[PDB]
Amino acid sequence: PPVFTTSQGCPVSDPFTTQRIPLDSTGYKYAPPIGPLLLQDFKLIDTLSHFDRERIPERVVHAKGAGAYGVFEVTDDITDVCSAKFLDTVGKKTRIFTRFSTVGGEKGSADTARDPRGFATKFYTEDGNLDLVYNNTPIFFIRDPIKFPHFIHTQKRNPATNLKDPNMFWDYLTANDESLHQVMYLFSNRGTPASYRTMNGYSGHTYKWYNSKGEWVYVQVHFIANQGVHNLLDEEAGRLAGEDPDHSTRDLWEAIEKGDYPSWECYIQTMTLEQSKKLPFSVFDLTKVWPHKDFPLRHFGRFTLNENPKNYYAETEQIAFSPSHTVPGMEPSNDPVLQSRLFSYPDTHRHRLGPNYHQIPVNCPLKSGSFNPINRDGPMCVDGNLGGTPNYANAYNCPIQYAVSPDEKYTGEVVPYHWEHTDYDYFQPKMFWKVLGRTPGEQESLVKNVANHVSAADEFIQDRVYEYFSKAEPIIGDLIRKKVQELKRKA
Amino acid sequence: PPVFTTSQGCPVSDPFTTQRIPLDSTGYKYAPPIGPLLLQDFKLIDTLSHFDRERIPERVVHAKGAGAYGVFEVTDDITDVCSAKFLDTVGKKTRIFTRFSTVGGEKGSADTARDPRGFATKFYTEDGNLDLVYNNTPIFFIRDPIKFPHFIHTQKRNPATNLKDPNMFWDYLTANDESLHQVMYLFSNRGTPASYRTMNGYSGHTYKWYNSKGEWVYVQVHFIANQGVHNLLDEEAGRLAGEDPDHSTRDLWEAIEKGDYPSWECYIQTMTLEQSKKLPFSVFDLTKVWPHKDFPLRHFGRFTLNENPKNYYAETEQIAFSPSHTVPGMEPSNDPVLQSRLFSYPDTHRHRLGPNYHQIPVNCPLKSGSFNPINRDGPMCVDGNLGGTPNYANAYNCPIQYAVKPDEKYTGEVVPYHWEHTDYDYFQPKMFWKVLGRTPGEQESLVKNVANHVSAADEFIQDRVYEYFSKAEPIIGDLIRKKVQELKRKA
Amino acid sequence: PPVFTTSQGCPVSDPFTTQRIPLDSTGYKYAPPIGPLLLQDFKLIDTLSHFDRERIPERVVHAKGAGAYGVFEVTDDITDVCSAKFLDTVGKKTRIFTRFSTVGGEKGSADTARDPRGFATKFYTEDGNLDLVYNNTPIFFIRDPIKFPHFIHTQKRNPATNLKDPNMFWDYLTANDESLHQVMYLFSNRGTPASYRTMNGYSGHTYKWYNSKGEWVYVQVHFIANQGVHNLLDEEAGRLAGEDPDHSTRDLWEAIEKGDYPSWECYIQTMTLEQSKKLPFSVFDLTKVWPHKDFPLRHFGRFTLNENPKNYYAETEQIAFSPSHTVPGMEPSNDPVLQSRLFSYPDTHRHRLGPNYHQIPVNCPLKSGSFNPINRDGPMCVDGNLGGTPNYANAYNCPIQYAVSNKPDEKYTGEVVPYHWEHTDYDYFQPKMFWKVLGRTPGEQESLVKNVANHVSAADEFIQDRVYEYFSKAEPIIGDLIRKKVQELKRKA
Amino acid sequence: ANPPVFTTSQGCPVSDPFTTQRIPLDSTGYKYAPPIGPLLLQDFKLIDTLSHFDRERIPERVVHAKGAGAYGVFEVTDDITDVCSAKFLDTVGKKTRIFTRFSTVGGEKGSADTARDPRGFATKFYTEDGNLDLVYNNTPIFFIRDPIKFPHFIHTQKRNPATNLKDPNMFWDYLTANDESLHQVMYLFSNRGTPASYRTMNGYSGHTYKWYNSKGEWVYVQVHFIANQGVHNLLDEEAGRLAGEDPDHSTRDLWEAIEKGDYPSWECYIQTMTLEQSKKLPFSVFDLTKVWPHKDFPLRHFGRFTLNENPKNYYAETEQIAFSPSHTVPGMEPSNDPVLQSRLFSYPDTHRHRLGPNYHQIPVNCPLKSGSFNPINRDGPMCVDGNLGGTPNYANAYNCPIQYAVSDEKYTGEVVPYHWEHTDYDYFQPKMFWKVLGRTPGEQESLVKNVANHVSAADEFIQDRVYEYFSKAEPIIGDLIRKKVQELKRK
Numbered sequence A: 001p002p003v004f005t006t007s008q009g010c011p012v013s014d015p016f017t018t019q020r021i022p023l024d025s026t027g028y029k030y031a032p033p034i035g036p037l038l039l040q041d042f043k044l045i046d047t048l049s050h051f052d053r054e055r056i057p058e059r060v061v062h063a064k065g066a067g068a069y070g071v072f073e074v075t076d077d078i079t080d081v082c083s084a085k086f087l088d089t090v091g092k093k094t095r096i097f098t099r100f101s102t103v104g105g106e107k108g109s110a111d112t113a114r115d116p117r118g119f120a121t122k123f124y125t126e127d128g129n130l131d132l133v134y135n136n137t138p139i140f141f142i143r144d145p146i147k148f149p150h151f152i153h154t155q156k157r158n159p160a161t162n163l164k165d166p167n168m169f170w171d172y173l174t175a176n177d178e179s180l181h182q183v184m185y186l187f188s189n190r191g192t193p194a195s196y197r198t199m200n201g202y203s204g205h206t207y208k209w210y211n212s213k214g215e216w217v218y219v220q221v222h223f224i225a226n227q228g229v230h231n232l233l234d235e236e237a238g239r240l241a242g243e244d245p246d247h248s249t250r251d252l253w254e255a256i257e258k259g260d261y262p263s264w265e266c267y268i269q270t271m272t273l274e275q276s277k278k279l280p281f282s283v284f285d286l287t288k289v290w291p292h293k294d295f296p297l298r299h300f301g302r303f304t305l306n307e308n309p310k311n312y313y314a315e316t317e318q319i320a321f322s323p324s325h326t327v328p329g330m331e332p333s334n335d336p337v338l339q340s341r342l343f344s345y346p347d348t349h350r351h352r353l354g355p356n357y358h359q360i361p362v363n364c365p366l367k368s369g370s371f372n373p374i375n376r377d378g379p380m381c382v383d384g385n386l387g388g389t390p391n392y393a394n395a396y397n398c399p400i401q402y403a404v405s406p407d408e409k410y411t412g413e414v415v416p417y418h419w420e421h422t423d424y425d426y427f428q429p430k431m432f433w434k435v436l437g438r439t440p441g442e443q444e445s446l447v448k449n450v451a452n453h454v455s456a457a458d459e460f461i462q463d464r465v466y467e468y469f470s471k472a473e474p475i476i477g478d479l480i481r482k483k484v485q486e487l488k489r490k491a
Numbered sequence B: 001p002p003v004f005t006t007s008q009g010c011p012v013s014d015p016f017t018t019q020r021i022p023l024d025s026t027g028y029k030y031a032p033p034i035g036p037l038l039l040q041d042f043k044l045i046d047t048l049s050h051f052d053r054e055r056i057p058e059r060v061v062h063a064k065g066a067g068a069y070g071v072f073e074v075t076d077d078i079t080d081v082c083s084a085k086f087l088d089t090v091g092k093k094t095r096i097f098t099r100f101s102t103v104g105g106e107k108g109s110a111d112t113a114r115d116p117r118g119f120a121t122k123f124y125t126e127d128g129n130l131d132l133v134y135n136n137t138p139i140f141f142i143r144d145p146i147k148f149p150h151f152i153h154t155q156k157r158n159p160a161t162n163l164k165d166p167n168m169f170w171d172y173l174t175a176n177d178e179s180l181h182q183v184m185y186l187f188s189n190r191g192t193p194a195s196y197r198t199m200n201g202y203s204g205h206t207y208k209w210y211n212s213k214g215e216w217v218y219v220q221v222h223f224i225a226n227q228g229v230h231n232l233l234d235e236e237a238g239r240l241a242g243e244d245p246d247h248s249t250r251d252l253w254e255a256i257e258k259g260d261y262p263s264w265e266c267y268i269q270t271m272t273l274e275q276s277k278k279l280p281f282s283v284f285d286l287t288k289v290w291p292h293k294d295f296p297l298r299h300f301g302r303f304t305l306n307e308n309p310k311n312y313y314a315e316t317e318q319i320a321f322s323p324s325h326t327v328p329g330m331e332p333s334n335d336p337v338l339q340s341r342l343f344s345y346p347d348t349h350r351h352r353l354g355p356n357y358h359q360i361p362v363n364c365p366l367k368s369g370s371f372n373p374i375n376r377d378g379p380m381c382v383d384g385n386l387g388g389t390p391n392y393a394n395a396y397n398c399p400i401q402y403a404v405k406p407d408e409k410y411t412g413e414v415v416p417y418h419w420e421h422t423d424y425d426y427f428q429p430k431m432f433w434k435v436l437g438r439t440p441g442e443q444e445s446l447v448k449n450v451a452n453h454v455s456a457a458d459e460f461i462q463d464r465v466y467e468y469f470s471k472a473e474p475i476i477g478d479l480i481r482k483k484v485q486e487l488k489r490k491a
Numbered sequence C: 001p002p003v004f005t006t007s008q009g010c011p012v013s014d015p016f017t018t019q020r021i022p023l024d025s026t027g028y029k030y031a032p033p034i035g036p037l038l039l040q041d042f043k044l045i046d047t048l049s050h051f052d053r054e055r056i057p058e059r060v061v062h063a064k065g066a067g068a069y070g071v072f073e074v075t076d077d078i079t080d081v082c083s084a085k086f087l088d089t090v091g092k093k094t095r096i097f098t099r100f101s102t103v104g105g106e107k108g109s110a111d112t113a114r115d116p117r118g119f120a121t122k123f124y125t126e127d128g129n130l131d132l133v134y135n136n137t138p139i140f141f142i143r144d145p146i147k148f149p150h151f152i153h154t155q156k157r158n159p160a161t162n163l164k165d166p167n168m169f170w171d172y173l174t175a176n177d178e179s180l181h182q183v184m185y186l187f188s189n190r191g192t193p194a195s196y197r198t199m200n201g202y203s204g205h206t207y208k209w210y211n212s213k214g215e216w217v218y219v220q221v222h223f224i225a226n227q228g229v230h231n232l233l234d235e236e237a238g239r240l241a242g243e244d245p246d247h248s249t250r251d252l253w254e255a256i257e258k259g260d261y262p263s264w265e266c267y268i269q270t271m272t273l274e275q276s277k278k279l280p281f282s283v284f285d286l287t288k289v290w291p292h293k294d295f296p297l298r299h300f301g302r303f304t305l306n307e308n309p310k311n312y313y314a315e316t317e318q319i320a321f322s323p324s325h326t327v328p329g330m331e332p333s334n335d336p337v338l339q340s341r342l343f344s345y346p347d348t349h350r351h352r353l354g355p356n357y358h359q360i361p362v363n364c365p366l367k368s369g370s371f372n373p374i375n376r377d378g379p380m381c382v383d384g385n386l387g388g389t390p391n392y393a394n395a396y397n398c399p400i401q402y403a404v405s406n407k408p409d410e411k412y413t414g415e416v417v418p419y420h421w422e423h424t425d426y427d428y429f430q431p432k433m434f435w436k437v438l439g440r441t442p443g444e445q446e447s448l449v450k451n452v453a454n455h456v457s458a459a460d461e462f463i464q465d466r467v468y469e470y471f472s473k474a475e476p477i478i479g480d481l482i483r484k485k486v487q488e489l490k491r492k493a
Numbered sequence D: 001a002n003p004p005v006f007t008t009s010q011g012c013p014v015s016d017p018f019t020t021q022r023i024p025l026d027s028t029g030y031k032y033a034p035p036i037g038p039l040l041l042q043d044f045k046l047i048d049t050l051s052h053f054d055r056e057r058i059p060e061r062v063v064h065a066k067g068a069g070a071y072g073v074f075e076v077t078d079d080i081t082d083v084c085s086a087k088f089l090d091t092v093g094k095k096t097r098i099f100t101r102f103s104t105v106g107g108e109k110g111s112a113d114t115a116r117d118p119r120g121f122a123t124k125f126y127t128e129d130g131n132l133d134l135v136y137n138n139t140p141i142f143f144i145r146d147p148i149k150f151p152h153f154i155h156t157q158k159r160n161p162a163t164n165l166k167d168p169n170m171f172w173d174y175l176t177a178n179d180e181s182l183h184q185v186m187y188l189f190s191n192r193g194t195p196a197s198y199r200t201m202n203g204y205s206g207h208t209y210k211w212y213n214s215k216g217e218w219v220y221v222q223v224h225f226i227a228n229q230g231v232h233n234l235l236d237e238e239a240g241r242l243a244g245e246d247p248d249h250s251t252r253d254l255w256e257a258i259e260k261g262d263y264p265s266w267e268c269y270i271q272t273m274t275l276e277q278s279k280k281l282p283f284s285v286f287d288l289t290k291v292w293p294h295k296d297f298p299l300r301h302f303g304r305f306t307l308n309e310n311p312k313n314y315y316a317e318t319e320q321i322a323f324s325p326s327h328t329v330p331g332m333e334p335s336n337d338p339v340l341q342s343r344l345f346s347y348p349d350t351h352r353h354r355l356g357p358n359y360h361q362i363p364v365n366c367p368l369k370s371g372s373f374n375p376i377n378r379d380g381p382m383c384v385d386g387n388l389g390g391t392p393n394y395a396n397a398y399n400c401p402i403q404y405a406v407s408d409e410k411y412t413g414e415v416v417p418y419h420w421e422h423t424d425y426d427y428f429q430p431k432m433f434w435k436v437l438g439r440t441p442g443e444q445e446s447l448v449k450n451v452a453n454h455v456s457a458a459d460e461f462i463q464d465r466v467y468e469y470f471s472k473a474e475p476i477i478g479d480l481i482r483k484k485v486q487e488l489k490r491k
């Protein structure tokens, strides 16, 4: 056994006693020793005041989540595409942490609420930590970075009531066409995954990979579930929201405690700069996919999730990912949404966790060290602050090693831009309508789902939603209208 | 009509554009102007970095809640008991704010979860802000202050899984007998109110009120709903949690907008020092009630809630109550739980909100000013910091006016105490069993509710639970074991 | 009379009393009522716990400073150069706040320390707050943004000792040539001004100003003290440093309380894009000035400082400036140092003061309001959070106005390039000229030598040697004169 | 790997410490054409290093902001187990690792080491029974004996709320209105207010504490640490010149002495006093303005300590170290000294703000020699210690056996508000102090010289009050200060 102590190592005799000077007991039928509590009762203050400070801000988005440790293995040679050390040589293994999450829901909300799902993985490489911060859909609601807070605002609560507002929700989406593609995924049954074990991961954005000769290619990354894609119907997700809000969390934890380790197979699509020039859409458009016919998937690795964390708060809660955490061989593209993400994530980490959040164990570059003599001091500096090491570069008395050193071309002035709609923007949602209804029940599900949601909205706004979905296939607005009034008929 | 600006007031022409230098477009079939985002895009960084910082910590407890403004009225003369200015003269109106809450649930959790409910009221008087930080039960789970974090921890999530753990839950309560009284409430249908409009508020603790002669008396405050006490059945509460996790929030906001303003009538129980000496229990025991036959309720006022906040975060989320915020005429008793609360609430405020949280509007002493020249500086000092006023008392150049009988008596040494069980502790739980089953279904409900929750616990711990309830009435344990078996049979 | 209360408005009878239960007095020749302090003593805990939290971090740089309110007046029509609202019409007056500062010293350090001086002024205009964050020199130590923390670190304290380290100090400067120009200023007597009233302000950087047709010109801004430029000698500065560390602060506060209000006349230098293409140096180089011969100053305004703050902490300490706080008519240039500043200052403010620091009175846009429905919540939200105004643009139930929206601008060609400014022979030319400019005044040149010599005599020999080489890059005699005087200083031990 | 590789905070290798990414302006037409353009959001190296620079600073301590530290060894040299059961005092020859911080009081971070102030003398002992802080001053007494006066006192010692200048009016207005300061002020104005170095001053517990022997018999104590380097002071003039020449003089003195191996050391003594002996005294053991006379209570030698090791990083160790008088071990308790009593609360409270909620996880602050085990205290910001993984967060958890280490004054009356009231004896000891100086030539004139220079900047009316005040100790003093006040006014 060990000895129960205060935060400073002073042993404690009883966990439950507090100091008091008792009232005089003369006259009392019942006289337990009661009196005012004392400032000197250190055990009391020291435990209370720590209790008082247990909480940190939840993430602005993706607040609700579960995570696990595991292993990534390189299974094919792709060194002709990508020079990254963790991909160096076949059969090489890298430790990973993956956090799954919903989007809008706050910390106590339901695992089975309707949302995209977050799929973020930290790779502890010899070249630093690489964060693959992916969603469970290959596309997204926006392609203008600054629209994010607007969008996310209308996904959450009314500033006054603190209730979800169907009016906001649809006012935003219908006013911004480009959201159509992702909204259709959201209201399809894909919006309601059974478990994290049964969903895919997609980079969404295009990134840029470099081989060791300095030749680069556009890439899109797919992680595909060896457990297969299974989804829930609205009724079922709804019931589970009430019976078990932590369903997915529980699912993933138990799977792992049993030995039923879920795993994913990892592919990429690649494309050259010349190839990109001939497309009807931009590689920088987060609302688009690369058709599988024209750009096939190339296998490169897999990963398996096999180890639960030891304490949830310390690891799952405090872990911090950013797309700007990358390694040599992988750069980000000019996808403007991704570009802004490069700044946000570290910025928000500094607020949610604190200036030195990389010093928290899960966030440490465990496989490679770090040596950054220029970043010093700041709150809660626990890593030794490099002792006496000089804090500027080329110090006479500290020799440091630096690593060995066509691309895209730019023309024009500095220009303000908001992505402008063209005809092709409706084409990909059109095809997705066709992709559903290659399965019985899928099209009818979308309609029934969009309809239950939209029926609480005011009429003038329901109308705009019909118009909106009809931009994909005219039948959809009609079918949704037809279902909305069936629901109103009942009561 | 307003003009859309930066945080610094500079006007903005388009809310959606961001600055880039575009890629050369020779050869592209589709050529939108895309390029890397720039540091100089102030509108971009300004709105993102703020977005990155929207969240503050949720309250360690009572995180999930709803609030409203109202009016309190003095309806009878109680100046013989209490000298407080806001009870001065009959007919006197005081503006209030009330926040209702559940206890253990985090911010996205369900309104209709089984819990006590918080009932906290801020009174803006001529003598300062008075916080009556009440529960919807006249008792509580604990009477030793330092047990609170232990208790609350077992009420929440497992350190490793982040799941609720029925093992913890019952392992704590059964190990700590004194919880039995409150747990019987919690598992009665009273653990599940229909709305906040249909519940009572109770001071729980005993306070001390003083009249203008300096004569004091122990008090217990009752707030009784003019809307009557209505509860939900477990089946319903579980459904509501799934269909509408914001049921109680919506209920309150809608009532008020409709003009169905809820109200409560206010009563006190009073008791002299002499009287207290003759009781089989302590006035300082939070697990005890004052029987109504022995100490009758005296009406003194009513309050009505009639005004929704304008911004939920700014008012309802940022408001800070503390039992140590009192006025002349009301002091705290030696109730050691209450004692410890006097420290915690301001302590936690300084962490949740910030050192100067009393400068946030809802938290201001609106009716009376403040003038506290010793309290200066600190982060986010927004109230002017008293300009040039000297910052010590009896400064030569700053003249200040200050405000213009037998009390309790103490003897002995400083003594460490943990409240020790006596036979009477089980007596009041016994009576509550008799109080239930004066209504058909109440008793069977308690058993049903305790059995459903406990069936997921391991056998050895189910066993302790039976023991535990039987300490109130022997049939109860046996009835729970009966239903536990029945439920296990089906599965 | 006002009534002494707690933070919560409860009246307090005695400022000095604390609650206790007394020890039994029996047997005591002296028995004052003493006992353990109580948790329920709210007056105690409330005032102590606030006292516990009085401090916030100091600025990473320019920590030590003094501020005042004033008035800016447009005195000439420059609407042909700049469309900014506060420069609209002749005679227009704008409320300002200026904060003067030293660079490297911490909060307790001396006002008469050798350092550049900061000169930051916040203008409350009808189109938002404009910060003109200037120094007292038209140039600076660096022209590569990311070098700043390196440079600053070496100006400050050794990671182990917490002492200044003359080895670091010179190690950095000497390894980075471009600092020579500004280092010469620093060690001439201009690194030691007499007061803040007797120094000039310069934009340092090149900015871009736009008239209402959309025609833009590169600018450099000059604030010239009507009280003239007066400097101290080393020995005087050092003595004052021991006698009155707050010399400059006192001086400014007293001048204004007398009515001896200090003032500055404002000029600009302008230059067209076409003119810039012909120069031997870059408009984007913070280590260069624009010769007065070729680009003459144009007078446009004046400001006077005439009002002390009411509470120093609340106003001088908490005020936050940022070069990215600008108004229509004025944009930053591609000066990479300036560029990085655009990000830094608001970033640091969020740390030093907090997420919602603009809500602090001095930092508010007082003359124009603000309406930014996208920015909500965050810690210490005190401005009402816009009540129930929808928090997204083009909300169906919230009608909004935007400001009314061209000519040839700068043009860009190439790939994304990593660049660290590379030395050319012209970099030494302007330091060479500054040696000639000193020595048109007796004693100026010999001062720089003495000042560099006394500082560098605590450095190890091997590093002293690099310093002579360094100054000798401007004019050879300077190393030799410094080596000579360092050796004659060593002579005594 | 040696030489170390230069990386970002996340471990990614960097090629050049000084480069930043841009897209260059077109160079056609330029006589000089370096590649200049707008900086980019994607430049991680830039944002990463700037944003951390932006956050280097934390609040300085409210008082004692200017300091220097070193590590050393304390040795038990005598048997005092009849007085104190403290483990680190257990057996003769036992060595304990300590860290000591020396500081001035009111000065801020950039201020002079040789300013006139008391000097702090704080030492952390890492014992097997937890961390012990002996938070001492270089004088055996202090300015106040009423706790809540501290902020008033400290405010007037510092800067004017409007000017930010020191205000001699304030300074003395406070001191003269509060008589009990006279004793300490004499110390302060004697040459002892200006030590030559930290090596050449003593440390004194100031307060009375209570030590327990293993039988549980206690005794009041006072601790003295006496410099083996002797007590050497400076003259005001010297103190003022050094202030300009070398504001870091004491820091440099300490560092250099240690680096040379001229380790400074202190011998440790205690005075003891029984409860009964305390009853017969003309003053209280609880009065910090009082010393125990050496004739009646002789010093008993018990140990020594030596400071032999400079810190590796100043910020990480010296700056972030946190001491509190409430950090104690078994065998040592605090007394009822009300100033000490309030200090028990203050120091932890301030720590949580200066450093943060989990400051005890910072290395220098860890109980290094004893572990800790406090399963109740979890989560909270920058939680870096592993948060005890899966260990239950409540006591007497069915699934986690814990061990609890196994183990006077009397009180009578009501709760009473007290401000200590002046009696005739208060002036007596300052009177003795005047006699103690002037046993050495130049000491009495000095005090006079020093008080005069400081006071000659105050307004006349307040100078008068200062004369009266010193005269309360000995009438000549007032008149001698008035005398040298003019000798100065006439030079």
Ligand code: HEM
Pocket (backbone or CB within 6 Å): C048, C052, D060, D061, D062, D063, D064, D067, D101, D102, D103, D119, D120, D121, D122, D135, D136, D137, D142, D146, D147, D148, D150, D205, D206, D207, D288, D321, D322, D323, D339, D340, D342, D343, D346, D347, D350, D351, D354
């Ligand atoms: C009511 C009276 C006092 C109060 C409320 C008080 C409070 C404080 C506070 C808030 C700090 C800053 C600590 C930190 O920021 O980590 C501090 C530091 C300090 N105090 Fe006091 N103090 C009082 C009197 C005293 C006395 C009587 C002594 C001498 C016995 C003393 C010695 C020190 C020392 C040496 C430090 C700095 C320790 C370090 O370097 O961390 N103080 N005190």
